[PDB]
Amino acid sequence: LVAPQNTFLENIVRRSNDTNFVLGNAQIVDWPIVYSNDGFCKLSGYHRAEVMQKSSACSFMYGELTDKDTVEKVRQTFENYEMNSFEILMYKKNRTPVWFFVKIAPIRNEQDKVVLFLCTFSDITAFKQPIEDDSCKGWGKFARLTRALTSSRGVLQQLAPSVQKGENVHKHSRLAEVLQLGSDILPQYKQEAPKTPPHIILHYCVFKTTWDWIILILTFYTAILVPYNVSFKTRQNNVAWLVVDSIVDVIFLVDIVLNFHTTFVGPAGEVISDPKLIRMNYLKTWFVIDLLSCLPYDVINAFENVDEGISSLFSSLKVVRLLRLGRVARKLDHYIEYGAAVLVLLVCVFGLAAHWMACIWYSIGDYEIFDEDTKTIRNNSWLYQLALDIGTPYQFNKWEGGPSKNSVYISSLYFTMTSLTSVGFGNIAPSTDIEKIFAVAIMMIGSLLYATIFGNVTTIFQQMYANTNRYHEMLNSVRDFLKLYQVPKGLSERVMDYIVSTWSMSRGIDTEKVLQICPKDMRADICVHLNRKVFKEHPAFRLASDGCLRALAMEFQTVHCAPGDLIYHAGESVDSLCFVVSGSLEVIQDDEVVAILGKGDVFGDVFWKEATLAQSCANVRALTYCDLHVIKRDALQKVLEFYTAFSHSFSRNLILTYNLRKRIVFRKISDVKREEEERMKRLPPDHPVRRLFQRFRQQKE
Amino acid sequence: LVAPQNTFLENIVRRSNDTNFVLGNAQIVDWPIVYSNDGFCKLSGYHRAEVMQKSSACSFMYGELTDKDTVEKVRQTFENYEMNSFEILMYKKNRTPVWFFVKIAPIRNEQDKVVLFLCTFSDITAFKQPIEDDSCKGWGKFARLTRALTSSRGVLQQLAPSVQKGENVHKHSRLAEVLQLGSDILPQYKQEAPKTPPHIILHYCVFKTTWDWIILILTFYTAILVPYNVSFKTRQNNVAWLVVDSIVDVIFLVDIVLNFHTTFVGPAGEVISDPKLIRMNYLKTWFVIDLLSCLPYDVINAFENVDEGISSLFSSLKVVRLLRLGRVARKLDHYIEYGAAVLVLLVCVFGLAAHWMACIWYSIGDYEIFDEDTKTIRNNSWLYQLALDIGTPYQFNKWEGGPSKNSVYISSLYFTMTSLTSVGFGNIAPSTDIEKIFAVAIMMIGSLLYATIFGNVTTIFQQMYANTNRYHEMLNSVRDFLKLYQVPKGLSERVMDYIVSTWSMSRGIDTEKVLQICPKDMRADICVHLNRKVFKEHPAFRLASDGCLRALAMEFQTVHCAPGDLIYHAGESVDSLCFVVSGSLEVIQDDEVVAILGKGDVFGDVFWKEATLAQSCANVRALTYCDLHVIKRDALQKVLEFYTAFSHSFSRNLILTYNLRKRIVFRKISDVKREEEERMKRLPPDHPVRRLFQRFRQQKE
């Protein structure tokens, strides 16, 4: 989410440290100036526009005291493209001769070419010999030159008055700030994305995504396992549990380390990648909590110490890595956001709450069943009830254990579960006060959890139906309109066929909306792409310029059509030129076929010549599914008159297939036979019709 | 929700009591008139427009009989800004000389300045000596003057014919209505919000809001506690319950008093704050109910009287303060309305209904268990069943009590609860007829309550997803369109990058919609703010007037762009001026870099000079993320020709960085070397090409 960016001006101005620079082209003869810094503009007194395009040699800066040897040296250093520095008198706009130190640095290109020359300048007037062509006084001229030397007199040499013979180090101090420009020359005219530090890996790499999926699976597995072991306090018989616990805790610590070594996205900035601040930000935000939550705290339980009862609660506290997950959810859900991702999040929280409240019901029962050394059986307890139900009742002499831990686990799970979805079988009763308060807490939280899933599942029916409903409402309105206004079957089915076909090919595409969203130049490129067919195939466009091509692409509109469609009916005013790129067309003149139109054909009229609109002499009808491109007369004329140069070539190259303004005369064989046989079968009062004949002859004259 | 308002005209006209007044400026020499009342307009006969801007001295009113002493007195009283009153003959528009009483009152300003002079006038003709320059008759002139004196003859002196020598009090009666104007002078030209009475406190103060939160918590606590004590009829063992009950009832009475002393909002008026009506409105609407509901009625139970069984039902009746809360809800919910406030309202009504129906189930059981002195155990009762289930069965000799009240409370709560959410454990059965009807009532109301929460929770998924769905549908349509029309990868990713970046930076912002919602002047201010950058930094605008600045701000449009974007391709018609405020730009001429554009640069053409559009000679492309401001030629020309004065300064100050109409010529070093080595390696039939050469020379001539 970043563009190949160029930063040369900002980089060079920031590296300059209040110095000045001038830029000029390398490959053009005499190397014209392409840029001048504001500092140079003010130092020379000449404006940027008047220094623009001038020669890099700065001959326009020269004066009588300039050195032909220096001129030759700058000339040959330009012609050989090496780094150098110089010292020479130069003339300001007031034609005051003043001293200058100069350095040159041509800049290479990413293509290993060399494109640019870079210049730097500095005053040394207050330190060189005094010179004055004309002055009010020698001391006054000295003071004025020293006050002009403020650039050197500033931070670059502010310590000078505390020392003597400072010129032994002032030259090097000035030269270092220009020698630093070698780093500025590095990008070599290239515009490119900035770099990021190593050992901090981009968060969006596929390897990091599968790492995120792995830590997902790990935290889900730990959230399963933890409440089980902590509730039942089972014996550590197989070392595998401790092995898995320690490895998964250390892999979580490594995950925290990679968050400490990975890119992060902030609300105030699209990408944040500086190690010097990302680590501290991650710390101060959430890294302290991550450290508080993700260590292998079970090592304390594995070891032995005087910390009686201190470290027990670590397991549920470290389950919370689901909260790291929830922070990641903002991104990770979007891989299934299409698909209602929250469905899995629901299922997971269901399972988690079920297991949690299973262990809670177990804990309450276990705490209640025996009344300590008082030996009160408390037969009212649910666990006693289930023990007697399943058999193997308790005994004493000593105590019998009755039910087994596995069966009792599933007992608790199943009660939690039935409470969760309100089926309430009722075989296992919450007899005691605290059992029965816990029943409050569980079924309340269950109902709140329960409402959400109905909302979630309803959230998809809009997608599943509303599009069809939009189609349905337009179709129903069309039906009512069409039937209400009594359109016969032919035109009615033509209308509905057009509606259904165009809707099938379109649906949700808003092509005009996409166009107007698109910015002007990309719009130009899109329409050029869409009219590429006619542009390449028709020879009239083989000569066009890119600008006129773009404008014509804006103007062009493409029409698909069904067979039997009538494009130009007789007597209609022709106003458009049109091309055929698919299908075929036919022309009807006086109910007679006179022309057929195929691929690549173009017909219309010479608008640029006639300049007057005319009626259509014939009818043109489709016989195939055809694609056509049409152009309006006025816009075509405007583009043509703007591009007069292309206009002449376009006029002389373009030839039409048929011209709608002209028409042909003909005779039918049947009509000729009728006339011949009528002649085979074959006036003084006709003076009025003869007068009409004479009038017609005069009009035709 | 009120603006700093001015009411001087309405206030003074209402205080005037049918008198007249005239206003004039204080700080302008000769004090021109700024306003004239309609009464004065009609009394003088001169129209408002012709009296406008005239001198406050009313010299244009004067006549031969006027007094130079009075003229000097009004002059010096104006020059010294004191209050005074006067009497003088003046002339009406018909040039009839008539008597006038006059009073003057300059008005101060909120800045302790003085800005305005106020005048008042009145006729005394019928009481002063008779005067007539020319008349039909003396008695007729007397009658006409008396009929002109109707202003004094009206309500100000209507009692005069019942008295004699009334002039001893008529002057004071007239003067009082003008002396009242001192209160009218109070606001001192200031426009400000009106005042509200003390001891009635604004309802929206933060202290009042936290008071509302406190009364919320109090009524919630009382609603918890009341059905418990009233159902179980527990002994009053700790005085703390009575203490809390009495303090909370009296704090509710104090709350009712503060509603009686606080602002209230009515549908017919945005703010209602008059004590003389707000108290009565609050009374007649709801204050009678508040008094009916909020007293410490438990004092009767604490005391002793012959009122056997009268005062018991007070507690549930005073719980209803949740209805005061519900009236407040219209406002109070909106602090959590963002956040689906109704969720807490649900949770609260849940808890309330649970506890209520707990106490109801308890009441039914307690009423049923024992069949009075008949000693029928009624073992069918649910409470008997639970007693035998838990143990400690009932006994007699005398009666054993069995279950304890705490356990029985939670029993009832828990049954109500399981009935509420239909889990229906079934261990506690409604055996008896009435138990079992109550089961009807509870589970019916439970299902009605239950449906609401699903609606509530579904109400959020639109917010959670529909925005993403809008983005999804446009992206899907773009994908289908782009792939269907076979755009290569380069342009395809350019398009999708533009779409996603613009959508990320925009989302729900409809900037154009905000603009068109905004009214014209604030639109002007917004665009001035947005173009402040160019306005302040570019010297050409340092001279502009506010009106032309506003119009140009309306015209300006800003464009952000990505690197590689081509603004003006070669051969395109230049029609816009444009400025650079961010990033950098580069210019390509004949595939050669010729110019670079930086911060603050401007390029285009001199439209106001050339007046003819021209094609672009070069190409300009972006290398950085850049922000630009563009101006259309036609609107710029129109604004300039309107503001001709600024036009000359703008033309003479403005200088372009590069002009698209002009172009540069150059040569390549490689091309020069090729030509030189070709010359190192180096016509009669050429007459046709020589003729072309001669034609070219003639055309260039």
Author numbering:
A (entry chain D), B (entry chain C): 10 to 406, 412 to 696, 704 to 722
Task: Share the article's original sentences.
Here, we present a cryo-electron microscopy (cryo-EM) analysis of the mammalian Eag voltage-dependent K+ (Kv) channel in lipid membrane vesicles with a voltage generated across the membrane using K+ ion gradients in the presence of valinomycin. The Eag K+ channel was chosen for study because its pore is gated by both membrane voltage and intracellular Ca2+ through separate molecular mechanisms. Four voltage sensors inside the membrane regulate the gate in response to membrane voltage, while four calmodulin subunits in the cytoplasm regulate the gate by closing it in the presence of Ca2+ (18). Voltage-dependent ion channels contain structural domains called voltage sensors that control pore opening by membrane voltage.
The intermediate and down maps (no symmetry) arise from the class with a more heterogeneous voltage sensor and have overall resolutions of 4.9 Å and 5.4 Å, respectively. The intermediate and down maps are less well defined, no doubt due to conformational heterogeneity. In the intermediate map, the position of S4 is in between that in the up and down maps, the bend in S4 near the cytoplasmic surface is still apparent, and arginine density is visible below, inside, and above the gating-charge transfer center. These features constrain K1 and R2 to lie above F261, R3 to be in the gating-charge transfer center, and R4 and R5 to be positioned below the gating-charge transfer center, thus corresponding to the net movement of one arginine or one helical turn (∼5 Å). As expected, the pore is closed in the intermediate and down conformations.
